[PDB]
Structures are given as structure tokens and as C-alpha cells.
RNA sequence: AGGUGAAAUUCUUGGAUUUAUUGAAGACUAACUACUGCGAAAGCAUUUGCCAAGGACGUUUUCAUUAAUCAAGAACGAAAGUUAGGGGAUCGAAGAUGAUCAGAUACCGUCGUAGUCUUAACCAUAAACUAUGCCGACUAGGGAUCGGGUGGUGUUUUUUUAAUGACCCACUCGGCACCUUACGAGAAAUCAAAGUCUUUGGGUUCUGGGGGGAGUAUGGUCGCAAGGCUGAAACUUAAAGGAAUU
């Protein structure tokens, strides 16, 4: 009864994405980011500027018709920090602060096999 | 006795040529000429007779092999790849 | 001086583990010394799940959470994150508070 | 502007590099039912209404 | 200066039969221009959703059935069964400490030349009279146990091909057909079908992928 | 007389009168002097057994291969050098295949393809040494050595001529659009200098 | 002075008058 | 978009980053992963097949001292380095530079050659750690845990109790470390051995003797090299060092 468009945010540093599509992918509707809401960089993985991005694609979804969003959050993963940064949650709780409708709430992030070796070196980035 | 200490069938190439060179050529050299084992008969009278080719003192079964050996590493590889794909057209 | 029984940590009985990287420095350091570390927290944050199974459809779902490793490799893990250092008497204290 | 209005009913403790600001639990005016975690500057008691001029928004511990 | 929503015709999301509320969603593309139309555009798309939600029973929150659209009748998308994922939310929880996994995995035709790798995980149990704190697998019971696991799967499919294939992953026959045989070799424990994939499809036999859409 | 990869004289029976033609097929490691070969589109794979691409299935490898099925061979020809069979389709008759060189030309599924790779294995993997062995080499091949370098010949001679040192004066990196006379070493160079890193494709 | 590092300053000396001494054997 | 203390270098009307259905490639085999398994050691973490193998155990099975440790000598020995083919995804000495800095040949960032990996060979070195010889017996209990085994008309197994399997109770050798005091031992630190040693002797290989000079000169010896091995002296100085307390 509701039309229904997965999220696909990217909690991490540096950045989050907050581009709406629809159930298979094939073709999206909207996208944004948070540096997009900010002139000054290092506020750009920040929730402030996470939810203001979360505040467009929201209004942008309403101006298409679809209801539904279902979240599928997702962390840099891969061979790099794998943990969902500063930015999957001050833009899920913008995202229901808007009025749209939340569903089937998941994640999906680039888990492997250890494989490759993550960049830095064995002492690693010290500082 | 003791005639060439490291340069086995290299003494033909006296000084000259280098040392690494005839190093590397000793290794392969030494592999073809020896009297080779051939795996039909049993009977190691395959020995090589010109490039790529291995004549069997018995029944003459000429073998196809490799510029200086039977087989080279990948040429068995063949073998399994055959055999595996052989039986999955078969069963 | 000596102060460590199972020394960097649990190797005995065997001679060559395999170093994990680190989940801050990217730092390799051997899966016994690396202090380990769960976060299985929930999907959202504070009162979050209140509009969140609100503005929600479903009743409520189940409400995922994650389920991730966290590896540090004691320098990050001694940034006064899991320690606080501790004393050659109490040092031998395997618990969770 | 979605102007809202909050209603101090939890002050905690206090964060920052000086720690002149506090972690201050608050609950909307206009439809509460729910409470948001903002934080503030000088002086509060949980009896004080404060005016964000953020809908979305929270923060506790600051470096 | 164009807007691509000026273009956009939308449509829709219609599952093969066997499930229950084919009506997933709507879906937007590029409208048949001339040279060049979305009926003969995307298809070899996905749908990527939970099971419960095509079914009907919320019950199901975890399996994602993987679509593939094939025709698009008027607006109307016939997709049709392309695999089935395991959530990582589910499949994170189901991984605990001081136990073992039995993952397993084989590829088979069904009636109709279809090949799809079905996986299934597996887990030990402790029993109502356990005390250690853990409990792990002889390595080589993990042996008879990924030995039957995988020989469960190809001994009674290729069955209506992946017509009651499919109607057999939803009533999860495998779950307990599985933990039934394993009975004289260990406990377990969730023992789920993990996932499956598509990864040679026959013809495109529109007289079979009708047998759905009707 | 001047390969290095033995030629098999496979005389075969004609079927259009009671004769034996002998045909060649390339020699490829495993095979020896009493063999049976098959030819055809039903012919179980085996060493020396040759059929169309189609009739076989991926990773197979070949050598003295078609190009169209009638060229009576072309392809991995010299001592070794094999060639797999990747990407595939039944219909269209085509095979995505794999060579030497390492290029992924596509070809038609109904192409002969000789089992096996050919016997000549590890060759330039060892030292001619002395230059004799160069000589008698090409002896029995073509007079296309000993070549002389350019900038030793005179300025008349050769483009790379002349100068008071030896130097060839300008880039010997001539592009891919000269003509006979004025092209002379580094024909269309994409690069040029030591090779170190990312090669083959991309 | 890091001990390894010590043992690569001689290294080089131990090969710089392996050279020097090869100049007139 | 990248990325950081923050910037930068960098990538971007050629539509990147991002999303999606796919493709190939090399690598890896996480999560399960442990005060755990086996290996002489270095190590060895995906599957199935194959090819042998080793240990524990159980044994009213067998030979019958065949034995323990071991200068010379012989095999395997991480990674780095190396010779040459195949492969070269990631990372990444070098280098390039972007910064901060007084300077930064540094750490932080982006790209990236050897290497990375395999094939046939080399190379024989690590704080190769248990900084702790091998072999034996004894001096101590506890609970775990690991592999086999003894017994329990025991748990659980329902197609019938069929049978076993997992599990619990005591036992049990061989694993694995751990906890508990010290009777003893140890400069202390600490340790079931580093105990059974001034009440000083179970067999036994090696090694060391203030500190530097120096694992250097030298020669010899192995090695393609790097360098391995073998290894001085002169001379100078009264401390070096260990452990622990303040």
C-alpha cells in the first residue's frame, strides 16, 4: 500500500551519504551529503551537518511520491574502519523528525574475509 | 676423483661465458641428457634425440616432451585439467 | 624486569598465532596481546527507537542491532579508552568492571 | 522555522574543555511525550525553559 | 534544465506466484522514448527484500528474497526468483562465543537445467544437563556434518525445479530436515539455510514463467 | 629445419577412397609414436584430440588453433605457448579465449583446436652461450643475423648514423606513421624505457 | 645509540674497507 | 569526492565519490578463535579428494638393552635480501612531493618501482622468547580444559528400549597452561621448578668470567652478494650491570 525506496546512508568520517532509491537500485532519486550543508570541510561526517543533509533528501522523497524508506545503513567497511560513523544517526532521527516512513530497518556494509592487508604499516599511522 | 668441484658438465665452456651463465645452463643441460625413464616400458632407454623429441631403446616409442626434459611443470598441469574435465563429458 | 606470567599474552603451547590488524591504527599485533573488545550496540542511539518504532512501519519490527570486533593494539586501547593501567597486585585481574 | 520549545527537567553534570556548559535533559512544551538531550551555557535549574532553535539535534560529552 | 522525474514513468513489483502479496513496490525509469524504451531498458534488475514481507507473517524478519525482473507487462514487473541472502543482522547474532560453525555449500541442476549454489549454516548446542561454560565440535564430527549437510540439499531437490524449491526454503523444511538427520551425530543449534544463488538460468521459457504469472 | 617444436607426420585414412593421406599436426608434450588422434565434432577430449571450441568446455587448453573454422590451424604454434578457453555461448558459436600474448579475441565455437600444449617447453629459458649456436640457428632458418646497431652504420647507411661519438641524435621512438626509410626502432611506443609494474592489460 | 643502528654503521664500514682492500689485494 | 589537529596535494559539465546488475584478476580465508589444537623447530587457521605421517591412549601383542645426552658433521628453518620464469589486485623500502616546523631529508597525507605471491633454487638469520638444555625419579593439593579409556539396568535419544551419539558423576594416563601457599629455592624479582646445593655429587651437550675495544682487525671457511662462520690484540677506565626501596 506504500511506496517503498530503500535509504542507503554511509555512516563514516570524513563524510555521510544520504541517497535514496528505490527497491532494486537500478535507478535512484535523490542523493546529497552533508558537506553539501556546510562551508568549513572536518563538519562534513558531523551530525548536524548528517541531518540537514537527512532534512533535503527528505522533502526531496515527499516531492516524488514514494512514503516508504527502508534504512540500510552502511560502514565504510571493506579493509578499512568498519564501524558506522557520526553520521547513521543524527540522520535516522532526522529522517522520522521529517515524517517519512521508516520499514524493514537493516544493514548491509562490506563485510570480507580479512583478505587484503588495510593501509598504514605495521608500527601503523602513530602520531 | 674430484674433477670439477661445482662445474660438473660445464668444464666444455672452460672460463669464458661468465659464471652465473653456465650456473643456470648446468641445471637444465644435466635434466635432458641424462639417460631418461620412460614411463610406458619402465626401461629408462628413452633418452632425447634432438629438440623436443625422446626415442625409447625398445618399441622406439618417440615422446613428445620438452626443449630440455619429458615434462615441463605446466605440461602435467595438462594431464590433471584433461583427466578432471575428462570424466565430467563421460559422467 | 619480568612482569607479565602469560608475558604479551596467551602463546603457550604453540609458536606462531597471526597478527589481526588493529580497528584504529590499522597496527598489526598478534591475535593473543590484542585486547579485544564486542559492540553488539543497537541501531539507533537515545530516545531515538521512540520515533523510531513511531514513525515506523510495523509494530515495531524486532529492532536490529550490529554486531561487530573491535581489535586495539594496547597504545590505542591505553588512550584512556580499556585500562586506566593497573597495579603489580591487581594487575593479574581477568573481569569485566 | 519549526520553532520549539524545551522544559528543563533533568540537569546532569557538565562537559567541555572549561566545563562552563551542561549536559541538560529537557522535554518539549508543545508535544512532549518525548526528551531531547541539548546542552547549554551559564547557569540552570530544572525549572528554567530554554528555546533551541534545533528540532533534531543532541550532545554529551565534549573534548 | 531537463528533470529527470519529467520522464520518469513509474511502475510497479509483481512476484512469480508461489509467494503470497506479490505487490512489493513501484519502481521509476526512463520513459519509452523513441529508439529505445524501458520495456526493453532495465530488467536484469533486482529486488532485494525480506521474505515476511512478501508473505505475510512478519514473523519471517530475517531472509531476503533476491529478484531478477524478466517481463515487464503493461507497468506490471513478472520478476521471478533470482536467490535468497541471509540478513548479517540475523547471521551476526547467530555467531556466539565458546561454540563452533558448520557452514556448507553445492551447486546442482533441478529438472528444467537449472544450477544454483544453495549454502546452509549449521551450529552446536549444549543439553539439558551441560556444565562447561563452552561447547565445540571433534573436527571430525564437523566433517560428518558438513558431509550430511550437503548431501541433505542435492539427495531431494531437483524437485518441480525451483518452483517447490522455493516453496520449500519459505516452510523451512531444511532448518528441521537438517537438525533431523544430524540427531545421531550432535545437538545444534539455529542450523538455517544461510543462503542461495542463481547463477545459470536456462531460456528465457516464458511458457514456465507464466505458470507463476497468472 | 628451423623450429623448435617437434611436427607430427600423422598419416590419416581418406574416407573418399581406400588412401593414406599423411597430414601435420603440430607435436604437443604427451603425445609419441603411436598415439591415436581424433579429429571432429564428436570426439572425446584427450590429449592430441582436436574438435571445436564449443565441443569443449572452459579452461580446456589448445595451441596450433583456427581463427574461422577452415584455416587448418594459426595460433600457439611455437615451442610451448598454449591458450585456454574462457567466456563461452552456445549459440552465435563464439569463445571467448585467452593467448600467449595474453589477448582476449574472441572467436567462433566451431574453430579446431589442438589438445594439448606444444612440445618445446622452457627453450629460452636457457642460454644459446656461444654465438655458434646462433648461427647454425638462424643457418637453417633465414639470414636475418647478425644484426648490426644502427648508430654504428653511417649517416648514409642508416638514419641512426653518423655523429663524432656514436649517439643517434634524435628520439628512436619513430611514431607508427612513417614510412620505409623512416621508420627505424621504437615503432609506436605507448611507453618506452625500463618496463616495472602494472603490465599485461590494465 | 639504538644498538641495531650501530650494527648497520659498521656494516657499511666492514663493506667500505672490503672495497678498499680489493683495490690492491 | 579524498583526507587530516586542521588544511593541503589530489579527483571532479569528460557526470566523479556515490547506487546498481554484472566481469576478470591476484591475494586472503576474518566472524567461529580460546590464559585452545597439532608440529622438532620455523609454524600451521576455507572445501573436498588423495598421498604417506606423527602423538596420546588402550593392549595377558612383539624384539629384548637394542639406551640417554651429544664437539665434527647432516635435514627443515619466519621475514628481509637473491637468481630466473609465471603473477602481479592491496599494501608498499626507494622516490615523488603535499604539511605542520626554525629546518623535517621525520612522523601525517596522495601515487607508486623492488618486494609482496607462486615455480625451480638460493639464502641459514630474529627479543628464532619458555631471554629458562635434553633424560629420569621424586617433593602438592585444587579445578578447569584437551585426546583416548574404565564403570555407572545414569541424563537425552521414539520409528520400538531398537543401536549408538552428545552430556553429567567419580576414575584415568598423556596434552595444555592456570590458581593456591612455600615446606624449599632464589640478590630480588619471582619459581612445582629456577625445588631435592656448603647436609655442596642421578647421566649428560654447550656456554660464560669487570666494562669497553668488538662479533671488530686478521686470516681461514660457506655464500652470487648481503654478509654467515670462525675470531684477536693493543690501549684505556673503576666502575658497567642486575633487582629493588625511597
Known amino acids: 500500500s506504500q511506496v517503498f525506496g530503500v535509504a542507503r546512508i554511509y555512516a563514516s568520517f570524513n563524510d555521510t551519504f544520504v541517497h535514496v532509491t528505490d527497491l532494486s537500485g537500478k535507478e535512484t532519486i535523490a542523493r546529497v551529503t552533508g558537506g553539501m550543508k556546510v562551508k568549513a570541510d572536518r563538519d562534513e561526517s558531523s551530525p548536524y551537518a548528517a541531518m540537514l543533509a537527512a532534512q533535503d533528501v527528505a522533502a526531496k522523497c515527499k516531492e516524488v511520491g514514494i512514503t516508504a524508506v527502508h534504512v540500510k545503513i552502511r560502514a565504510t567497511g571493506g579493509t578499512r574502519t568498519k564501524t558506522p560513523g557520526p553520521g547513521g544517526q543524527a540522520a535516522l532521527r532526522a529522517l522520522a523528525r521529517s515524517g517519512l516512513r521508516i520499514g524493514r530497518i537493516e544493514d548491509v556494509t562490506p563485510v570480507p574475509s580479512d583478505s587484503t592487508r588495510k593501509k598504514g604499516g605495521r608500527r601503523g599511522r602513530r602520531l | 676423483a674430484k674433477r670439477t668441484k661445482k662445474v660438473g658438465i660445464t668444464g666444455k665452456y672452460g672460463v669464458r661465458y661468465g659464471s652465473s651463465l653456465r650456473r643456470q645452463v648446468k641445471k637444465l643441460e644435466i635434466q635432458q641428457h641424462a639417460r631418461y625413464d620412460c614411463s610406458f616400458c619402465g626401461k629408462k632407454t628413452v633418452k632425447r634425440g634432438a629438440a623436443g623429441i625422446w626415442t625409447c631403446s625398445c618399441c622406439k616409442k618417440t615422446v613428445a616432451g620438452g626443449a630440455y626434459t619429458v615434462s615441463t611443470a605446466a605440461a602435467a598441469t595438462v594431464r590433471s585439467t584433461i583427466r578432471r574435465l575428462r570424466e565430467m563429458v563421460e559422467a | 624486569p619480568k612482569k607479565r606470567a602469560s608475558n604479551g599474552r596467551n602463546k603457550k603451547g604453540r609458536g606462531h598465532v597471526k597478527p589481526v590488524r588493529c580497528v584504529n591504527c590499522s597496527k598489526s599485533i598478534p591475535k593473543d596481546k590484542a585486547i579485544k573488545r564486542m559492540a553488539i550496540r543497537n541501531i539507533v542511539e537515545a530516545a531515538a527507537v521512540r520515533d523510531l518504532s513511531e514513525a515506523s512501519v510495523y509494530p515495531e519490527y524486532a529492532l536490529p542491532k550490529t554486531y561487530n570486533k573491535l581489535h586495539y593494539c594496547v597504545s590505542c586501547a591505553i588512550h584512556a579508552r580499556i585500562v586506566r593501567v593497573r597495579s603489580r597486585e591487581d594487575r593479574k585481574n581477568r573481569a569485566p568492571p | 522555522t519549526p520553532v520549539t520549545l524545551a522544559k528543563v527537567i533533568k540537569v546532569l553534570g557538565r562537559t567541555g574543555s572549561r566545563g562552563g556548559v551542561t549536559q541538560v535533559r529537557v522535554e518539549f512544551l508543545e508535544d512532549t511525550s518525548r526528551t531531547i538531550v541539548r546542552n547549554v551555557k551559564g547557569p540552570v535549574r530544572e525549572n528554567d525553559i530554554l528555546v533551541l532553535m534545533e528540532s533534531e539535534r543532541e550532545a554529551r560529552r565534549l573534548r | 534544465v531537463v528533470d529527470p522525474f519529467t520522464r520518469k514513468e513509474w511502475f510497479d513489483i509483481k512476484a512469480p506466484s508461489t509467494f503470497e502479496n506479490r505487490n512489493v513496490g513501484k519502481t521509476l525509469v526512463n520513459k519509452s522514448t523513441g529508439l529505445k524504451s524501458a520495456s526493453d531498458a532495465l530488467k536484469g534488475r533486482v529486488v532485494e527484500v525480506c521474505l515476511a514481507d512478501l508473505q505475510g507473517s512478519e514473523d519471517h524478519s530475517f531472509r531476503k528474497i533476491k529478484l531478477r525482473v524478466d517481463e515487464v507487462q503493461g507497468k506490471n514487473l513478472l520478476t521471478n526468483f533470482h536467490g535468497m541472502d541471509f540478513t548479517t543482522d540475523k547471521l551476526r547474532s547467530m555467531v556466539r562465543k565458546w561454540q563452533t560453525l558448520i557452514e556448507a555449500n553445492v551447486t546442482v541442476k533441478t529438472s528444467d537445467d537449472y544450477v544454483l549454489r544453495i549454502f546452509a549454516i549449521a551450529f552446536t548446542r549444549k543439553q539439558a544437563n551441560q556444565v562447561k561454560r563452552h561447547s565445540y565440535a571433534q573436527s571430525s564430527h564437523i566433517r560428518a556434518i558438513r558431509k550430511v549437510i550437503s548431501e541433505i540439499l542435492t539427495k531431494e531437490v531437483q524437485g518441480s525445479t525451483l518452483a517447490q524449491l522455493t516453496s520449500k526454503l519459505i516452510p523451512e523444511v531444511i532448518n528441521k530436515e537438517i537438525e533431523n ?34 | 629445419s628451423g623450429r623448435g617444436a617437434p611436427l607430427a607426420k600423422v598419416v590419416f585414412r581418406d574416407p573418399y577412397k581406400y ?72 549459440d552465435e558459436n563464439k569463445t571467448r579465449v585467452r593467448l600467449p600474448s595474453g589477448a582476449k579475441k574472441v572467436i567462433s565455437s566451431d574453430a579446431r583446436g589442438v589438445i594439448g600444449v606444444i612440445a618445446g617447453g ?35 647507411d642508416h638514419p641512426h648514423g653518423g655523429g663524432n661519438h656514436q649517439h643517434i641524435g634524435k628520439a628512436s621512438t619513430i611514431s607508427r606513421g612513417a614510412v620505409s626509410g623512416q621508420k627505424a626502432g621504437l615503432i609506436a611506443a605507448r611507453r618506452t624505457g625500463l618496463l616495472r609494474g602494472s603490465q599485461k592489460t590494465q | 645509540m639504538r644498538a641495531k643502528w650501530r650494527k648497520k654503521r659498521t656494516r657499511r664500514l666492514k663493506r667500505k674497507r672490503r672495497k678498499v682492500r680489493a683495490r690492491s689485494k
Open chain 5, 181 to 214: 538427520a544430524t540427531k545421531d551425530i550432535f545437538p545444534l543449534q539455529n542450523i538455517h539455510v544461510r543462503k542461495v544463488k542463481l547463477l545459470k538460468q536456462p531460456k528465457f521459457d516464458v511458457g514456465a514463467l507464466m505458470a507463476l504469472h497468472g
Open chain 6, 19 to 90: 588412401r593414406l593421406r599423411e597430414e601435420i599436426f603440430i607435436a604437443n608434450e604427451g603425445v609419441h609414436t603411436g598415439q591415436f588422434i581424433y579429429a571432429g565434432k564428436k570426439a572425446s577430449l584427450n590429449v592430441g584430440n582436436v574438435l571445436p571450441l564449443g565441443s569443449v568446455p572452459e579452461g580446456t587448453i589448445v595451441s596450433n588453433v583456427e581463427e574461422k573454422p577452415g584455416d587448418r590451424g594459426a595460433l600457439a604454434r611455437a615451442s610451448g605457448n598454449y591458450v585456454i578457453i574462457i567466456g563461452h555461448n552456445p
Open chain 6, 122 to 156: 622452457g627453450r629460452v629459458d636457457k642460454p644459446l652461450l656461444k654465438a655458434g649456436r646462433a648461427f647454425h640457428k638462424y643457418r637453417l632458418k633465414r639470414n636475418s643475423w647478425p644484426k648490426t646497431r644502427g648508430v654504428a652504420m653511417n649517416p648514409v
